[PDB]
Design a protein around this nucleic acid. Sequence first.
RNA 1: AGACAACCUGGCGAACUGAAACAUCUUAGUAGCCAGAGGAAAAGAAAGCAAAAGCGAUUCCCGUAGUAGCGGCGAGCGAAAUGGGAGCAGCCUAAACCGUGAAAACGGGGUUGUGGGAGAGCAAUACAAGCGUCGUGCUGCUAGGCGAAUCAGUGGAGUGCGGAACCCUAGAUGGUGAAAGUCCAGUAGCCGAAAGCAUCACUAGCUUAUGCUCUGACCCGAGUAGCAUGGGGCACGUGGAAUCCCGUGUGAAUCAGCAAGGACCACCUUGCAAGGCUAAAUACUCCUGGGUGACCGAUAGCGAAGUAGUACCGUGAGGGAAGGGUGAAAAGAACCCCCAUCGGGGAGUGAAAUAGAACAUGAAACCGUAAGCUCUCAAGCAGUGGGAGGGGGACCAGACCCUGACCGCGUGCCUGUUGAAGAAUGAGCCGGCGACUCAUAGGCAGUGGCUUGGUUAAGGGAACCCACCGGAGCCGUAGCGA
RNA 2: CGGUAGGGGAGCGUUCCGUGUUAGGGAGAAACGCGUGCGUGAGCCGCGUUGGACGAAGCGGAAGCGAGAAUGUCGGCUUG
Lengths: 115, 72, 184, 212
Amino acid sequence: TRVKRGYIARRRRKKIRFFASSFRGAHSRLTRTIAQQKIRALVSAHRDRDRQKRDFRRLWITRINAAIRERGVYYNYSKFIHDLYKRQLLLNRKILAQIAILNPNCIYMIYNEII
Amino acid sequence: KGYKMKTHKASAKRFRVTGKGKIVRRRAGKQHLLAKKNTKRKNRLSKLIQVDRSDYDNVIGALPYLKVNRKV
Amino acid sequence: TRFRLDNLGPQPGSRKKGKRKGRGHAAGQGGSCGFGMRGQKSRSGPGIMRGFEGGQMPLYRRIPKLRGIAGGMRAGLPKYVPINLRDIEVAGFKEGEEVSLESLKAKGIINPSGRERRLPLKILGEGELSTKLQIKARAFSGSAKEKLEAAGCSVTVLPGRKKYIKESVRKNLARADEYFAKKR
Amino acid sequence: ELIPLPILNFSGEKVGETFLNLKTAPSETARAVVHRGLITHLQNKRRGTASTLTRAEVRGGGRKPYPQKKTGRARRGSQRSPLRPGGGVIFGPKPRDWTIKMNKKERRLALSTAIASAVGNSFVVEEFAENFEKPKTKDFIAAMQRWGLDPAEKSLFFLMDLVENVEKSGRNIRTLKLLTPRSLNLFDVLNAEKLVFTEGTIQYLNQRYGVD
RNA sequence: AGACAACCUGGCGAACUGAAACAUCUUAGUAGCCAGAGGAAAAGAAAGCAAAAGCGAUUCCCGUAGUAGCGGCGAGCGAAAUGGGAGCAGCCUAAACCGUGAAAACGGGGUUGUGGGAGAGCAAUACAAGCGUCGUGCUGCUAGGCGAAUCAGUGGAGUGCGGAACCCUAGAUGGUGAAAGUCCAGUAGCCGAAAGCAUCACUAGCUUAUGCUCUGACCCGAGUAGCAUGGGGCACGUGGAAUCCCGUGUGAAUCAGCAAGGACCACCUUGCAAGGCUAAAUACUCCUGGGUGACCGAUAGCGAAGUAGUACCGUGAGGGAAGGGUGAAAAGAACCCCCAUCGGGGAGUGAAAUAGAACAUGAAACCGUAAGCUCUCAAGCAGUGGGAGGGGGACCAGACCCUGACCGCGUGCCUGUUGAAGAAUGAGCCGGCGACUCAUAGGCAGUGGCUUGGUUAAGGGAACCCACCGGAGCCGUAGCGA
RNA sequence: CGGUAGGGGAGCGUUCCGUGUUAGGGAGAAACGCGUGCGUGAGCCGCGUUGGACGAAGCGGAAGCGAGAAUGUCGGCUUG
Ligand SMILES: [Mg+2]
Ligand SMILES: [Mg+2]
Ligand SMILES: [Mg+2]
Ligand SMILES: [Mg+2]
Ligand SMILES: [Mg+2]
Ligand SMILES: [Mg+2]
Ligand SMILES: [Mg+2]
Ligand SMILES: [Mg+2]
Ligand SMILES: [Mg+2]
Ligand SMILES: [Mg+2]
Ligand SMILES: [Mg+2]
Ligand SMILES: [Mg+2]
Ligand SMILES: [Mg+2]
Ligand SMILES: [Mg+2]
Ligand SMILES: [Mg+2]
Ligand SMILES: [Mg+2]
Ligand SMILES: [Mg+2]
Ligand SMILES: [Mg+2]
Ligand SMILES: [Mg+2]
Ligand SMILES: [Mg+2]
Ligand SMILES: [Mg+2]
Ligand SMILES: [Mg+2]
Ligand SMILES: [Mg+2]
Ligand SMILES: [Mg+2]
Ligand SMILES: [Mg+2]
Ligand SMILES: [Mg+2]
Ligand SMILES: [Mg+2]
Ligand SMILES: [Mg+2]
Ligand SMILES: [Mg+2]
Ligand SMILES: [Mg+2]
Ligand SMILES: [Mg+2]
Ligand SMILES: [Mg+2]
Ligand SMILES: [Mg+2]
Ligand SMILES: [Mg+2]
Ligand SMILES: [Mg+2]
Ligand SMILES: [Mg+2]
Ligand SMILES: [Mg+2]
Ligand SMILES: [Mg+2]
Ligand SMILES: [Mg+2]
Ligand SMILES: [Mg+2]
Ligand SMILES: [Mg+2]
Ligand SMILES: [Mg+2]
Ligand SMILES: [Mg+2]
Ligand SMILES: [Mg+2]
Ligand SMILES: [Mg+2]
Ligand SMILES: [Mg+2]
Ligand SMILES: [Mg+2]
Ligand SMILES: [Mg+2]
Ligand SMILES: [Mg+2]
Ligand SMILES: [Mg+2]
Ligand SMILES: [Mg+2]
Ligand SMILES: [Mg+2]
Ligand SMILES: [Mg+2]
Ligand SMILES: [Mg+2]
Ligand SMILES: [Mg+2]
Ligand SMILES: [Mg+2]
Ligand SMILES: [Mg+2]
Ligand SMILES: [Mg+2]
């Protein structure tokens, strides 16, 4: 019994093609390239989601460090964290970084409660 | 109907089977130049002996109609 | 009906699928079909002869031939249909029955075929017999005579097949037969 | 034994009841023994008519079209290669003998346990060969209606001998299928919705497929 | 006379290859060439197998058995008897002698193996067996005929749907605007042949044809067998090498004999060479009729679904393509405008013209039009995680899709390597075709059946499948030893 | 519970056959094109101003069965 390839190669490649919507040039038009790039996109996505966690953290240190140098001279981020664990606080970088922008008056009180 | 497995006769003339299924051979070196050999050495070669475990893969592949038992 | 064309199926573990090599890597056997990189075992054709050892003298040449088989001496085959004494006890015979080839084939113990058909019957004597029946066999071993005669059985050795003898050969035997007979 | 079959007459009334005690495979494997006997019935039935042509059997070829080198193109040995249209076929089908072997006692056991399962949807009838002096499908259908059957669904009549007047009265119907001990098969038993027997077949069927 | 696909017979007769080289060997008495012949051919009616018990022409299948053996004892090659089935058929001549002839020759006589004929003498020899030309019928083939049962509605068409009926010895197929047991052709069943062919039966009348004693007198297929030598082929490579067939040279015997039984001798058994014919079982398909497909459906299937072995190429042998689908029905588009044609726009046809002929469903690469966001201080395997500003929609909206100011990260894919983004290999792109399969055996595992040990093979089997037979054989029940 | 060669285990899908003149289908099948749905994934389930007649699922079976590469290959179409 003879069996043509049929349509399984077509319906497969449409799923591979639909993922390549906004790609420029021949990376959205040629099947032998979209399969070559669709592989690369997910690896880059799986890699970024691991880097996604360290990146926002890296941004929160700057914002918290940037928002606290104004209070005291010869004072800095590293001294602020050492006092929280001394005072037995639990707040993380996410909450402190967002309060620094959204309710800056709170950190001025947190600095006072520590001292 | 058609093709049947053939026995490798040069191997059949050099290997046989015991009652349980052990393969055996004759030890070599007892056809010429026996004077320089001691009776202890010539006695060792005269006796039969079981064939090495590693070589059955070649013997059985050549002797398909040769009943054996690998578990003994 | 309970059973029907659309409610049957095989027993699990009885009908495996079968490896279709060369149909991707996730299937298990890869594109190379499980033969590694380029070599001789990976080629499309007959391989090395079983026993070949890369030019080294194989084991079927550096070993002498069996005794007798080397020159052409014929191997010794069975001359009789051996049956031990214990098997007769299991057959379930009574005082009156005999023991021959035709009797045992009826029970199903002895089932010869081909070469084994044209053989007599021999008794060996490994067992015990406590039924006191008669025998119609060809030959007997030493232990069998001691056991059967002790059990009150009735043995009967058959004459077997005759061997043709040249005329003058009978006279030399008759010469010796007359010699021993007249003296003893 | 457990489900005694009732007997019917040429009319729609009852006259008695009997049973049939056949050899049945155990429930742990009866579903598989019947399925093994069903494949071989069909795998022996199929005909190896598929055939193709290899590169040696296809017409043409033989000549090397262009030399091995000094040409900027992939090597080639013959135009009638599988890697070109109109060429050979790699490992294509050929006329095959699909026939396999199955032990008798397995095929016989698969047949017994199948009939022993259709007891709840079967029954027995008396002889009616004399009631048909001439072939007539109209009267034959009326008899099935009076016995409680539907010609729309499948059915099965198993009897000793199919006389001429009776076999012509069901030869035209597609659903109804008449059988004899020689024409008895496994395929028809499982396909039929309702079975029918006679006093002679219950005797013949019990002795050939007893439980002793 | 020549032609004739394959099978068959005869003659000549390779090589690559395998042996991991190669010459003995294998490939192989294959391929191909030549010759011949038939629907089959060839073989074939014991100078035979066998072994002390028996079989009774040849051929084919199962099995014996991958056994006994052969073999640089390497690769590899490979029996036979017994047994089980298919299918069964046995006949005509030379010679002794008697007549006819110068001879050659004609007629009669005879044809066998526990020996038979001739020869003579007795009987009784042949009706019932095998043949069978005039022709006479039987049955089939080569043209055909009869042949049961339905109406309406469903908006292109009703065989479908819903509803109501009918036939069936006919629910096999194909066709019909759309899928049919009841519309058509048909099928079941029945009928039918002047003429021709074939299978059978009958019929001439000549026809081949039936037994007991006497004899060890006359015949038993000659340049043959055998031997010596050189070779071939038998499973068996000169080996102890028989058996069978040839070249050279030699060269027997006639039943009181000869050959064979694996050197040879002896004994016994079996058989009667040197003349010939013969049906069936068996092998093949350029073809014919019927039937069936877990066969293909226009890159498939025969190379060929169209003027295919055409077009085209080649001095020639020879090689060798491609091109399928309007519609139920051409009703193939009157007429008007553009108009030199082609072609297009309306009209009209049609269920559909956005089916309009270069016309059926019409994917992708590729070439484009329009709309929404958007780039001219940039830099980058082109994306990804963040997501400014703007835009969008039958569900809703803290959602979703499109666009992407700017930051960060990120060294194409396979192949294959100690290691490749690699300036190592391969791919111009898209789509299709395209690769561990098949048969038969060995071993192992899993599952199943039987275990009162198991199982059949060929071969039969309502066409096959299949019910039921078929136990010959094979495996397992004693090993040790050359 | 990283993993190449390589081995084992469990599954998806294609075309065809059995149930099958199946269910369903000019009240629009196959196909094609789509999707705020589901799954570990191969894929499934659904939708339609396309299409115009076929044909699942389920329990099972068989293969000319899954392509991105072979200076592959046929046809079509680009670049220059
Ligand atoms: Mg971390
Ligand atoms: Mg043993
Ligand atoms: Mg792997
Ligand atoms: Mg690959
Ligand atoms: Mg492997
Ligand atoms: Mg490779
Ligand atoms: Mg290797
Ligand atoms: Mg090779
Ligand atoms: Mg080999
Ligand atoms: Mg060496
Ligand atoms: Mg031995
Ligand atoms: Mg060729
Ligand atoms: Mg050639
Ligand atoms: Mg082809
Ligand atoms: Mg001629
Ligand atoms: Mg050669
Ligand atoms: Mg070689
Ligand atoms: Mg070589
Ligand atoms: Mg002819
Ligand atoms: Mg004929
Ligand atoms: Mg014939
Ligand atoms: Mg002939
Ligand atoms: Mg002849
Ligand atoms: Mg004469
Ligand atoms: Mg009619
Ligand atoms: Mg109607
Ligand atoms: Mg008819
Ligand atoms: Mg003679
Ligand atoms: Mg010889
Ligand atoms: Mg001789
Ligand atoms: Mg001898
Ligand atoms: Mg003889
Ligand atoms: Mg073609
Ligand atoms: Mg097409
Ligand atoms: Mg269209
Ligand atoms: Mg078109
Ligand atoms: Mg600048
Ligand atoms: Mg700018
Ligand atoms: Mg290197
Ligand atoms: Mg490596
Ligand atoms: Mg490169
Ligand atoms: Mg390099
Ligand atoms: Mg280079
Ligand atoms: Mg390149
Ligand atoms: Mg390519
Ligand atoms: Mg391609
Ligand atoms: Mg393919
Ligand atoms: Mg393939
Ligand atoms: Mg292989
Ligand atoms: Mg096997
Ligand atoms: Mg078992
Ligand atoms: Mg059979
Ligand atoms: Mg048959
Ligand atoms: Mg792992
Ligand atoms: Mg780990
Ligand atoms: Mg389809
Ligand atoms: Mg239509
Ligand atoms: Mg189905």
